[PDB]
Ligand binder design. Structure first.
Ligand SMILES: [Cu+2]
Ligand SMILES: [Cu+2]
Ligand SMILES: [Cu+2]
Ligand SMILES: [Cu+2]
Length: 465
């Protein structure tokens, strides 16, 4: 009765060293009702692009939509020219080719659009995919590795639908304040699927692909999750947890034990974020059912020491929301949903960094290349959750929202929590990003990003003094 977990195709290079991605409109079915949806190589979501460290691939991207889009590789340490930020326009009916020279450790990354002012809508319509980066090191570890059997991607997303079955997306005053969220949870595009897994260890590559909703994964029968990797790759050793908070755009890979004759659910637990604890999410909600079919590593990798903080450039990034949006938006939330919404209290340019709404034509600063910087990101004076994402890098978190990072969050990350307090990350950019293809740094609550909470930055030379 439960549908099976859809498994994205694991896509590798052809004999020409090319991967073809087609962006296009189609249809999907949710709870019996048809909806217009968009996908990469299909109707919804996308494949998993498989990349090998030290090898180049060329991706041909065909935009068969009737509007512009871009294709950003979230978590990839590549040059601005192929980063697919807002300046990476792919015309409707057109094609753009990018060569990815992969040079970072094994990791589960992802890809999605980054079209200026419309990223939230384009993701909500269905556009997201995965990146599986492998290297020599990870293959020696004997992790579960049968793609779609015991090594399974799990993209978790909410949507809401109107009466006619169609996806009901709006960038309005309420969503620009608290984000777009819905009442229906999807798992690789399916509602509450089941996955058949071999007895032993199941590897789940978890992605929060929601526009705005934070998630908190756990198991129905309280069996633990062993986190083996974060956004940017393997942790030094497994970290046992009973629950796992995952912000929008973050990935974690976990190992969970599968025992004969004991089905259980992966679930998501209620979170404190405004709007996100409305029914059906006021209680633990199922994500998928694991069905055992009657068919743990000590050390995973090495995590280098944090470099000395002395003499590193510090960049301050002050996040803000115009008081007018903050009160009107929160008022709309509370009036519609009431106390359950838990409101802890022109909009197109009302969300800001350092007093400025995103300017695509004027990068705010030029970072140094090949040098560690200390970026201090503040949400002081605003109660909203901002998962802050910096392009072109995998960084280390020094401080996360006023505390040292939890052990499973102390490795390689591209996202950091900012909520009412201040975070500090240690970041290095190995590749060029010029003014014409700048790197983005932004809140990954997509409606904030789309209404100004993003900056462009360049990377070019730095160390000549
Ligand atoms: Cu990104
Ligand atoms: Cu706010
Ligand atoms: Cu935000
Ligand atoms: Cu480079």
């Amino acid at each position: 009765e439960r549908p099976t977990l859809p498994i994205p195709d694991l896509l590798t290079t052809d004999a020409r060293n090319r991967i073809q991605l087609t962006i296009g409109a189609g249809q999907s079915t949710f709870g019996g009702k048809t909806a217009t949806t968009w996908g990469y190589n299909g109707n919804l979501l996308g494949p998993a692009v498989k990349l090998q460290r030290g090898k180049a691939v060329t991706v041909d991207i065909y935009n068969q939509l009737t509007e512009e889009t871009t294709l950003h590789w979230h978590g990839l340490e590549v040059p601005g020219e192929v980063d697919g930020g807002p300046q990476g326009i792919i015309p409707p009916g057109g094609k753009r080719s990018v060569t990815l020279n992969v040079d970072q450790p094994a990791a589960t990354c992802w890809f999605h659009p980054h079209q200026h002012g419309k990223t939230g809508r384009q993701v909500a319509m269905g556009l997201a995919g995965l990146v599986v980066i492998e290297d020599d090191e990870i293959l020696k570890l004997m992790l579960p590795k049968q793609w779609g059997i015991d090594d399974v991607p799990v993209i978790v997303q909410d949507k809401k639908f109107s009466a006619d079955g169609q996806i009901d997306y709006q960038l309005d005053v309420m969503t620009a304040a608290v984000g777009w969220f819905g009442d229906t949870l999807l798992t690789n595009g399916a509602i509450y699927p089941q996955h058949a897994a071999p007895r032993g260890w199941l590897r789940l590559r978890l992605l929060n692909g929601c526009n705005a909703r934070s998630l908190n994964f756990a198991t129905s029968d309280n069996r633990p999750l062993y986190v083996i990797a974060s956004d940017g790759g393997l942790l030094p050793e497994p970290v046992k947890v009973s629950e796992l908070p995952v912000l929008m755009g973050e990935r974690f890979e976990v190992l969970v034990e599968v025992n004969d004759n004991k089905p259980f659910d992966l679930v998501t637990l209620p979170v404190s974020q405004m709007g996100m604890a409305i029914a059906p999410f006021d209680k633990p909600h199922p994500v998928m059912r694991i069905q055992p079919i009657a068919i743990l590593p000590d050390t995973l990798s090495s995590l280098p020491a944090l470099p000395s903080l002395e003499g590193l450039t510090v960049r301050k990034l002050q996040l803000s929301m115009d008081p007018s949006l903050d009160s009107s938006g929160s008022q709309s939330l509370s009036e519609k949903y009431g106390d359950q919404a838990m409101a802890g209290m022109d909009f197109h340019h009302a969300n800001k960094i350092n007093g400025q709404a995103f300017d695509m034509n004027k990068p705010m600063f030029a970072a140094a290349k090949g040098q560690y910087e200390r970026w201090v990101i503040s949400g002081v004076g605003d109660m909203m959750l901002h998962p802050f994402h910096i392009h072109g890098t995998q960084f280390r978190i020094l401080s996360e929202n006023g505390k040292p990072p939890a052990a499973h969050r102390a490795g390689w990350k591209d996202t950091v929590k900012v909520e009412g307090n201040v975070s500090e990350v240690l970041v290095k950019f190995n590749h060029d990003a010029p003014k014409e293809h700048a790197y983005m740094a932004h809140c990954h609550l997509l409606e904030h990003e789309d209404t100004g909470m993003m900056l462009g930055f360049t990377v070019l030379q730095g160390d000549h003094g």
